[PDB]
Design a protein around this ligand. Sequence first.
Ligand SMILES: [Ca+2]
Ligand SMILES: [Ca+2]
Ligand SMILES: [Ca+2]
Ligand SMILES: [Ca+2]
Ligand SMILES: [Ca+2]
Ligand SMILES: [Ca+2]
Ligand SMILES: [Ca+2]
Ligand SMILES: [Ca+2]
Ligand SMILES: [Zn+2]
Lengths: 466, 6
Amino acid sequence: GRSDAYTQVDNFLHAYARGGDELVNGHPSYTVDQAAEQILREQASWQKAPGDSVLTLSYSFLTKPNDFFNTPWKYVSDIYSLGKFSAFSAQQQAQAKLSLQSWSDVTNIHFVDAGQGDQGDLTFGNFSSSVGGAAFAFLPDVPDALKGQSWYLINSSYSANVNPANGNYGRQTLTHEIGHTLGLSHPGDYNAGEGDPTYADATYAEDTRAYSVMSYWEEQNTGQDFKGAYSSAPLLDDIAAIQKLYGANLTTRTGDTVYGFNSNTERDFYSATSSSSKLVFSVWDAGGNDTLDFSGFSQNQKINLNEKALSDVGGLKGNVSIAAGVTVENAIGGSGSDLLIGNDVANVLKGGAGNDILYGGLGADQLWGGAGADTFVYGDIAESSAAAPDTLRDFVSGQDKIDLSGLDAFVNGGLVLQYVDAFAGKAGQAILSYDAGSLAIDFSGDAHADFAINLIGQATQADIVV
Amino acid sequence: RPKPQQ
Ligand SMILES: [Ca+2]
Ligand SMILES: [Ca+2]
Ligand SMILES: [Ca+2]
Ligand SMILES: [Ca+2]
Ligand SMILES: [Ca+2]
Ligand SMILES: [Ca+2]
Ligand SMILES: [Ca+2]
Ligand SMILES: [Ca+2]
Ligand SMILES: [Zn+2]
């Protein structure tokens, strides 16, 4: 029967499932694309005039009240006095630029610094008298006198916007409000200051802060846990939504990029600095050989290298994801007992310390167990072909395990392995060799190998689980 | 006429 090691792989491959024909939390479950469409329901966007396919938008930080601040009721209904005006502080301006950068990273927009004043296509400013919310912005379908404007609440009762920083609510709010100015809405028909909106009023299940920064609702609603942290940058569904409007940015991080620990992203939200770092990000990456490095964590982690998939990283749940259309090649686990699932291409998987379960998937994968009793799992024959097999780079006999219990020939076929020196034309015959080693199995029974695994360090029959 | 945040 199927081993527990295989079961854990299969369960995490289908973890945080979306789509499907059943109601989730009393809502229909949406795919990433369906969620993106709903986010863009207002059909609001900036029109490309200087050049198509690439948009250029200027931004500035107001130094004095504008015409809208002075008399809001002349322009908008149900907004009267915004209180005291204050310019964006030095910290606010630097964090706004990082929020702006995180948007331009993922889509074809170039943000130009227009300095201090009312110059920019997008403007930023603080207000003190709340209109039911912590901040507000206008979508780009409004008249020119309001287009691009975002406003943020600062008073003695609300201080979240005063000191924005990586992982806090002040930063997310900035990313959220700029999202509005670019043309994104809340994933549901709800608004702060209007009645009593809850997660029950969402249009779809994946309307949480695990999938979109435009959402009001906490990640716990869809089974995630960020332990108090907020996403600083666009999440899975945000990326899909904004790319529908202004395209995918295929110039971003085209070289070999490391995410998590030892990061070369130069992005605070993509980077881990200590064993306590609370990571929340969705990877947008245009090309190259890329690595998820979570070696500095001690907790038991679950890492999924497939696109659109969510991972459990550094004591958090469903906090790391990979954007649609992104290929990430490599994963490095921490000192805890980790689960590492690869994707369709060639993957380098490193477990590190602890008892790790590695699943290369399709392609010829380089699998490092590290210290401890590690399990290398196979669910399909095509995952390690005789012509292009996996390599187990640090296999230790009597400690590590080759798991084949999930294979169709064992679960349903009822096949028993016969270890031999030559294939006589029988199903299940296996040749185990050593010099460096190799395991080659003839599952069909045509005297030719259809499944193989390359070995660095010898393996025995006892190291193979069926 | 705008779109507040929670
Ligand atoms: Ca890259
Ligand atoms: Ca890549
Ligand atoms: Ca693979
Ligand atoms: Ca590990
Ligand atoms: Ca290990
Ligand atoms: Ca090991
Ligand atoms: Ca493979
Ligand atoms: Ca064969
Ligand atoms: Zn909003």
